[PDB]
Every structure is written in C-alpha cells, then in structure tokens.
Design a binder for this molecule. Structure first.
Ligand SMILES: CC(C)(COP(=O)(O)OP(=O)(O)OC[C@H]1O[C@@H](n2cnc3c(N)ncnc32)[C@H](O)[C@@H]1OP(=O)(O)O)[C@@H](O)C(=O)NCCC(=O)NCCS
Ligand SMILES: CC1=C[C@@H]2O[C@@H]3[C@H](O)C[C@](C)([C@@]2(CO)[C@H](O)C1=O)[C@]31CO1
Ligand SMILES: [Mg+2]
Ligand code: NA
Length: 448
C-alpha cells in the first residue's frame, strides 16, 4: 500500500483531467515474433511493478466539495499497469508500416482512437471511473509494432513520463535499476517544491489565474474548424534557423538554442499568417512549457510533475516583422534558473494556499486565436529505448492525433541526427496559409 500525494503543481485542474500520449514505431520482420514481444513486455511490467509498486496505481481525489477541489493521491489500483494488446494487421482502417514510411509518419496515422488505450481529453466512455497512473497499448500492424504509452498528467509531465518509460525498458531487458533511479522514483512529491512564506499573490503567478474579464483557460476547444499536422525540419533546416537567429540576437542575449530558434520561427510564422485576418496591433502571447527540475535542483529521473511555463507578450505585427533573433531573445530571456525557481515556488504556494484551485491554469490568459501554447519534448530520451524486444530502436516517435486544440503545439523527441518534428494545431484559415507560405515552407516540410 501507498498513498502518494501528487505534486502540488499536479493538483492543477487542467493536468488532473488529461492523459499525455506518445507512440513508438518499430519494424517487425515476421509475425512469428509477436508472442515473444508480448511476453517480454508483460514480464517487464511485472518486474517494474515489483520494484516500484506505485507505477501500477491510480490517481484518486478526496475531500472534494463546494469551493474545494480536493487533493489527489496515487493509491493502489491493480497488480501491474494495464497493457491492451490489439491486432490491427488485417484491419483495413489501421496504418501499415509501408503506408507510414511512404507518408513520412503523419500524425493522422496515429489515431488515438485506434492506437491508444485511452483518449487524451476526458471525452467519451470511461472518462467520468479510475484514472490509472500509466496505460499501455501494443498494436500489431502490417510489418510493425506501435507501442503507445499514456501518462496521467497530474502524476507526470513528459520528462517524468520519459523517466518511467526508460525504467520500463530496463525492466523489460531485466537490467538492474541504479540506486539513484530508485531514489528519484520515490522522492516525496508534496515537499519537492519549498513554499514561499506569508505569500498571498505576486507576479510569480502572472498569466496563471483566470479572471472574469480575460480570455483563456485549459484545453479550449474553439468553435472554429481546426486540425493537427506534423511538419518536419531537417538537421540542416534547424541549423540554418539557429544561424539566422544567432546573427540577429538582442544585445542582452549571449546565445540562443536550436529549440529557441524553432519556437521563435513558429511564433513569427503564425503571427505572419494571422495578419491576413487580424490587425498587427492585436496582442499575442507565447506560452512555453519548461521543465522545472533543473531550477529546483531535482534529478532528471524524478518521475512526477515539475513543469511550468514562460510567458512572452507582444503584438502580432511586432512578432511578424522583427528579426528571428529578436524573437528568440524574448524566449531565452525568461530562462534564468533563479527566476524559474521563484516563479515555480510562487505557483506551488498559491495552489497550496487555495482549496479552490479551479481558477489556476498554465494557459489562464492565452487567447487561442492569437496565442501559441508550445511544449517541447525535444530533449526526452525515447529514441533510445528497445524494451528488450530485439527490434532495434524506434523507427519513429510521434504523438497520437486527438481533437484540435487551437494554438496548441508540441516538438517531438529530437531524432538523434537532429531532425525536429513539430505538431501544430491551428484553425483551417491559419493552417492553409501557413502551408502555402514561402518563408515557412523554406524550412518546414508538411507531413500531416
Ligand atoms: C525550455 C526548453 C524547451 C529549452 O530547451 P533547450 O533550449 O534545448 O535547452 P537549454 O535551455 O538547457 O539550452 C541548451 C542550449 O544552449 C546552448 N548553450 C549552452 N551554453 C552555451 C554557451 N556557452 N554558448 C553557446 N551556446 C550555449 C547549447 O548548445 C544548447 O543549444 P543547442 O541545443 O542548439 O545545441 C527545455 O529546457 C525544457 O524545459 N523542456 C520542456 C519540458 C517539458 O515540456 N516537460
Ligand atoms: C490538452 C493539453 C495538454 C497540454 O500539453 C502541454 C503540457 O503537457 C501542459 C500544457 C499546459 C497542456 C495542459 O492543458 C495544454 O495547455 C493542453 O491543453 C501544455 C501546453 O504546455
Ligand atoms: Mg472557479
Ligand atoms: Na547504483
């Protein structure tokens, strides 16, 4: 038995309600291999659960009442995490490995309804019902295997989910866990962010509390037609964007990263096409997800939810028209560790002080029409894991498609050669213009 209070940050209503999904594709040479794939995975899940029982638990809330959104804990559920095994080899609506390869692994070929064990959003059957900490699905497709992992978002951010998956891979291989891994997996969560003393409200929580007169909130489904698409950026395209940004930096900015440069290029490209439907004076906010473990001095192997955002406010015309380096400098300027730490402590403290957490959101004031809400998974280690399956490393690592959430965006785990894959969700008007935009298509290959 275990009763592990979630990270205070994981008590955010918008995180408690969603699952983060990721899919790994492997080629499978012969259908004779599938029974061993399954048994290897089941034995790995069993070994993992024996070492760290909470990975098989569920997230459960208690103390909910009027004006009290309660407190959630990881508590026992089943003996092992649930894996669903699904044979799609003869399903004509399923993808095939050759179809994938020919289309360049599009998001539309990773349909969460077909290849994931549970939806991202709390929509449909069984989303009212236990919330398992992690759920898995093995999908047999013609010539291949799609492994999908779902993580309960209050229990883990993608850095934490990567930590968990990485240890699952070790458990499948029957490789020992290190002492540091075991320690990180068992750190107390409710104390991992030290609170601020005598804190009511401050700039730490700017852009994170919903107000009646300000548009924003969690996973806003806009009443406009929208879609998801992947765009790939070659290692050369990425280095040319980084070069272009580096040449045009603000005087206050010594350097920017590859990630900064692409995030900036997208904000600029989005703002540029949006000029076709709104005035340049229209405000625009970039909300950028940031792993807060380094600022807090926490192990990269901590499997919980320790993430914040940085916020950047300008206007559509300014962002579109300024240099790439000006825009990348905006982003880099908010990454001082001391700042991230103070802001993160402030958010955690505000949450701790307030039984009613219903107004708190990482995108509290991000207007979907003009904003960019981006989370980069570029640094996570998913391209390296083989799960003892004998299939080699993943051929691709892609997020499943789900309902369009206007202005929400992700970077996939960076391919070892340096290729980036960006998932963009935009209203049709914006998406169509972006795809036809020469400055965009110079670097971005549309995949879908
Ligand atoms: C915010 C975030 C997206 C930024 O990622 P990032 O810019 O790739 O990583 P960092 O901020 O640590 O910076 C590392 C970069 O700075 C560069 N750098 C560090 N010191 C440098 C110096 N002395 N001179 C020049 N460049 C330097 C590195 O070369 C690297 O850039 P590169 O990847 O282009 O080679 C990321 O840290 C993050 O928190 N991920 C999101 C977590 C989540 O979503 N969950
Ligand atoms: C459905 C959905 C998932 C989201 O993904 C990334 C990150 O995992 C948290 C979130 C704040 C996030 C959480 O709400 C985002 O705003 C969202 O709507 C996000 C945009 O930064
Ligand atoms: Mg409320
Ligand atoms: Na050790």
């Amino acid at each position: 038995a275990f009763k592990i209070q979630l990270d205070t940050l994981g008590q955010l209503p918008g995180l408690l309600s969603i699952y983060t999904q990721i899919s790994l594709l492997y080629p499978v040479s012969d259908s004779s291999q599938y029974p061993t794939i399954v048994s290897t995975f089941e034995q790995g899940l069993k070994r993992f659960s024996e070492a760290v029982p909470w990975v098989a638990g569920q997230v459960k809330a208690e103390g909910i009442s009027e004006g009290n959104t309660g407190t959630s804990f990881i508590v026992p559920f089943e003996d092992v995490p649930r894996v669903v095994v699904k044979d799609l080899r003869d399903d004509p609506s399923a993808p095939t490995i050759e179809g994938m390869r020919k289309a360049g692994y599009p998001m539309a070929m990773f349909d969460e309804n077909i290849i994931a064990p549970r939806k991202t959003l709390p929509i449909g059957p069984g989303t009212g019902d236990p919330k398992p900490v992690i759920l898995l699905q093995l999908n047999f497709i013609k010539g291949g295997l799609i492994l999908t992992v779902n993580g309960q978002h209050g229990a883990m951010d993608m850095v934490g989910q990567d930590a968990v998956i990485r240890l699952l891979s070790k458990a499948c291989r029957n490789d020992p866990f290190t002492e540091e891994e075991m320690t990180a997996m068992n750190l107390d969560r409710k104390t991992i962010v030290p609170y601020l003393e005598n804190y009511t409200i401050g700039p730490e929580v700017d852009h994170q509390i919903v107000k009646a007169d300000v548009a924003g909130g969690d996973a806003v489904l806009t009443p406009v037609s929208a879609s998801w698409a992947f765009f790939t950026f070659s290692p050369k395209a990425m280095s040319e964007l980084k070069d272009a940004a580096t040449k045009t930096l603000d005087a206050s900015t010594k350097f920017v990263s590859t990630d900064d440069a692409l995030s900036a290029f997208i904000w600029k490209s989005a703002s540029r096409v949006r000029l076709e439907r709104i005035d340049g004076s229209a405000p625009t906010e970039f909300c950028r997800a940031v792993d807060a473990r380094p600022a807090m001095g926490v192990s990269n192997n901590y499997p919980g939810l320790l993430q914040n955002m940085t916020y950047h406010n300008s206007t559509i015309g300014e962002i579109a028209n300024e240099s790439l380096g000006a825009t990348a400098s905006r982003l880099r300027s908010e990454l001082d560790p001391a700042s991230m730490r103070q802001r993160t402590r402030g958010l955690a403290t505000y949450l701790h002080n307030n039984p009613d957490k219903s107004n708190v959101s990482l995108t509290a004031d991000a207007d979907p029409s003009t904003s960019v809400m981006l989370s980069s998974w570029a640094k996570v280690g998913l391209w390296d894991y083989d799960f003892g399956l004998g299939l080699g490393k993943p051929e691709t690592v892609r997020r499943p498609i789900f309902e369009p959430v206007e202005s929400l965006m992700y970077f996939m785990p960076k391919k070892p050669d340096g290729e980036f894959c960006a998932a963009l969700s935009l209203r049709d008007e914006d998406m169509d213009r972006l795809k036809a935009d020469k400055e965009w298509t110079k670097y971005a290959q549309y995949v879908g």
